[PDB]
C-alpha cells in the first residue's frame, strides 16, 4: 500500500521495497476546518420584479434605468415567462450565494428581429446608436417576448429608435437628443422612427421586453446579500468562514487594528485577507490560517528493522518537541554521540539500545586538551605511510 503507514508512504514515494537509513519526504499535514461560520446582515427587503411585462416600458433610445439596493435576490421564482436568461462573468445558477454590489436593471423594449444585437462587443445600428454594452461587462441579459401588449391591432406607434448618428455612444450612456442629422453637406433625416410591431407578421416583428441586470461584486461594503441566513460565531478554531459573499479558511482571533467606515476588509502583502469586519456584530477580527506543516520519516534501514519515527517540522506538540518541530516515536536521551541520521538544529536520531530510536544533541568529536607549556615540545620518533 501507499498510505496506511509511514513505511508504506516511504516505499510508495521511493518506488522500492528496501529503504535505506536516513530521512525521506511525504505529503504535508493540513489542519481541516471543523465548522463554518456564516455571517450576513439581516436584510428583510425583497427586490421588486413583478413591476420590472407589468404594463409598459420605454424604448431603447431612452431606456428605463433603475436602481436596486438593500434587498435579497431569488432566481428560482411577480415575474414574466422567459425565452432567454444569460449571465456573463458569473454563473447564472450560483447567484443567490453572493452578496452583490450596486445592482442595476436596465429596462427597455426592442424588436424580435434584433434580439442578438445586444452583447459586450456587438456592433450595428442598435448597439451603437441606441444602447451600448462595455466589453468588460458583468451582468445578466434577461429577455422575453411581449406581443400581449406592445403590438396593436393597427400596429404599434409608441416606441422609437435612432437610425444614424454622427457620434458614437459611450458605454452606459443614454441618447435623448433628436435633431435633423446632416447626412451630407448643406446643413439642414429625423432619428426617432416608429418600428413595425404588428402581431400579423413573424415573431421577429414583435417587441422583446429586455432587462439588462448589471452588478458588481465585493467592490464596496455590500448589502445585496442573498437569501442565506447567518449562523452563530465561533473563534480560536481552524474554521471556514464567509462575509458578505467572500469565502475563506483559517483561524479567527481578536484584532488590534482601527478602520474607517467606508471599507470592508484588510489585505496583507500577498493581497489576501488579514482582518475582517463582521456584518452583524460589526466588530473587527484577525485571520491566522491553520494550513501549515512538514512531514519527515526516519528509518534505521528496512534491512535492519521496521519501527520508524515520524518527524513533524512546524507543529507545536513518545511525543518529543524540538526546534526541528514535533518528533513522535523517539526516546530522547542525554547521552551524546556522533550524528547518525541528521535532523536539524543539532539533533540526530539513531537506532540504538527491544532497541529503539533515540534523539539527542550531537557531539563534535572527542574532547581533549593540549598540554601546552612555554618550555615543552613533542617530537615524533616513528612514521606511518597512509595510502
Amino acid at each position: 500500500d501507499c498510505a496506511l503507514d509511514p513505511l508504506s508512504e516511504t516505499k510508495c514515494t521511493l518506488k522500492s521495497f528496501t529503504v535505506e537509513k536516513g530521512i525521506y519526504q511525504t505529503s504535508n499535514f493540513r489542519v481541516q476546518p471543523t465548522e463554518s461560520i456564516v455571517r450576513f446582515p439581516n436584510i428583510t427587503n425583497l427586490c421588486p420584479f413583478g413591476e420590472v411585462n407589468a404594463t409598459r416600458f420605454a424604448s431603447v433610445y431612452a431606456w428605463n434605468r433603475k436602481r436596486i439596493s438593500n434587498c435579497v435576490a431569488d432566481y428560482s421564482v411577480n415575474s414574466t415567462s422567459f425565452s432567454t436568461f444569460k449571465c456573463y462573468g458569473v454563473s447564472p445558477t450560483k447567484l443567490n450565494d453572493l452578496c452583490f454590489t450596486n445592482v442595476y436593471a436596465d429596462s427597455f423594449v426592442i424588436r424580435g428581429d434584433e434580439v442578438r444585437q445586444i452583447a459586450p462587443g456587438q456592433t450595428g445600428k442598435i448597439a451603437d446608436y441606441n444602447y451600448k454594452l462595455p466589453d468588460d461587462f458583468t451582468g445578466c441579459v434577461i429577455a422575453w417576448n411581449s406581443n400581449n401588449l406592445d403590438s396593436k391591432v393597427g400596429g404599434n406607434y409608441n416606441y422609437l429608435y435612432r437610425l444614424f448618428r454622427k457620434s458614437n455612444l459611450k458605454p452606459f450612456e443614454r441618447d435623448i437628443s433628436t435633431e435633423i442629422y446632416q447626412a451630407g453637406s448643406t446643413p439642414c433625416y429625423f432619428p426617432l422612427q416608429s418600428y413595425g410591431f404588428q402581431p400579423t407578421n413573424g415573431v421577429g416583428y414583435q417587441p422583446y421586453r429586455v432587462v439588462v441586470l448589471s452588478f458588481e461584486l465585493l467592490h464596496a461594503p455590500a448589502t445585496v446579500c442573498g437569501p442565506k441566513k447567518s449562523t452563530n460565531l465561533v473563534k480560536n478554531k481552524c474554521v471556514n468562514f464567509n462575509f458578505n459573499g467572500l469565502t475563506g479558511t483559517g483561524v479567527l482571533t481578536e484584532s488590534n487594528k482601527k478602520f474607517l467606515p467606508f471599507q470592508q476588509f484588510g489585505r496583507d502583502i500577498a493581497d489576501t485577507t488579514d482582518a475582517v469586519r463582521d456584518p452583524q456584530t460589526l466588530e473587527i477580527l484577525d485571520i491566522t490560517p491553520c494550513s501549515f506543516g512538514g512531514v519527515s520519516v526516519i528509518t534505521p534501514g528496512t534491512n535492519t528493522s521496521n519501527q520508524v519515527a515520524v518527524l513533524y517540522q512546524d507543529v507545536n506538540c513518545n511525543v518529543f518537541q524540538t526546534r526541528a518541530g514535533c518528533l513522535i516515536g523517539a526516546e530522547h536521551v542525554n547521552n551524546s554521540y556522533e550524528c547518525d541520521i541528521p535532523i536539524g538544529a543539532g539533533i540526530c536520531a539513531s537506532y540504538q539500545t527491544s532497541q529503539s530510536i533515540i534523539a539527542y544533541t550531537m557531539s563534535l568529536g572527542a574532547e581533549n586538551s593540549v598540554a601546552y607549556s612555554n618550555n615543552s615540545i613533542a617530537i615524533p620518533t616513528n612514521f606511518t605511510i597512509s595510502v
Binding site: I379, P380, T381, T384, I385, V387
Partner: protein
C-alpha cells in the same frame, strides 16, 4: 520520457488520437497546448543539463589541478593531496571519473621533551641552523624537526647572534668544537 504521456490540459496524449477523434479546425487547440507543454518540459530539462554540466566542469578542472600538482610532482599545499605530508600520487581510471591514490607520510609516535630557544656558551647566543634543541634531562641535543635523531651541539650545527642577554629562555650550556681536539 514520462512527460510525454501527460495531457497538459489537452483531452488526450497522442497526436494520432487527437487528429482521429477530432476535426483539425477544432483540434489545432489541442495540438498547440500539447506542443507548448512539451517545449517547456524540454526547456526545463536543458536548463538542468546546463547547470549539471557546469558543476561537472568545476569538478573536472579540480581533478586536472590535482593531477598536475600531486602526480606530476610533490606539493606543499597542506591537505590538497591527501591528509598529512605528501610524498607522491597514483592516478587510476574509472567510469566517468578518475580515482587517486595519495601516498601521505604521517608521524605517529612522539616522546616528551623540555626545549629552549638558544644556548649561552661563552656569552655568545647559539641558535640551531635547521634543527631544534631538546633536553634528555641529563644533556641538551640538537635534532631534526620530525624525527628524534639527537646530535651533539657543535659549531656547524649552530650560528651566533651576539650576546645571551636579549633573548628570553636562553639556557647556559657548552657548545662542542671539532678544531681544538684536532689541533694536537
Amino acid at each position: 520520457v514520462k512527460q510525454l504521456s501527460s495531457n497538459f490540459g489537452a483531452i488526450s496524449s497522442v497526436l494520432n488520437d487527437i487528429l482521429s477523434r477530432l476535426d483539425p479546425p477544432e483540434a489545432e487547440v489541442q495540438i498547440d497546448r500539447l506542443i507548448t507543454g512539451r517545449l517547456q518540459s524540454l526547456q526545463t530539462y536543458v536548463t538542468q543539463q546546463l547547470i549539471r554540466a557546469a558543476e561537472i566542469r568545476a569538478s573536472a578542472n579540480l581533478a586536472a589541478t590535482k593531477m598536475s600538482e600531486c602526480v606530476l610532482g610533490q606539493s606543499k599545499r597542506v591537505d590538497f593531496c591527501g591528509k598529512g605530508y605528501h610524498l607522491m600520487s597514483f592516478p587510476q581510471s574509472a567510469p566517468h571519473g578518475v580515482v587517486f591514490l595519495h601516498v601521505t607520510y604521517v608521524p605517529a609516535q612522539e616522546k616528551n621533551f623540555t626545549t629552549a630557544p638558544a644556548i649561552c656558551h661563552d656569552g655568545k647566543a647559539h641558535f640551531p641552523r635547521e634543527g631544534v634543541f631538546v633536553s634528555n634531562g641529563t644533556h641538551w641535543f640538537v635534532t631534526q624537526r620530525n624525527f628524534y635523531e639527537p646530535q651533539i651541539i657543535t659549531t656547524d650545527n649552530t650560528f651566533v647572534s651576539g650576546n645571551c642577554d636579549v633573548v628570553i629562555g636562553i639556557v647556559n650550556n657548552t657548545v662542542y668544537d671539532p678544531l681544538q681536539p684536532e689541533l694536537d
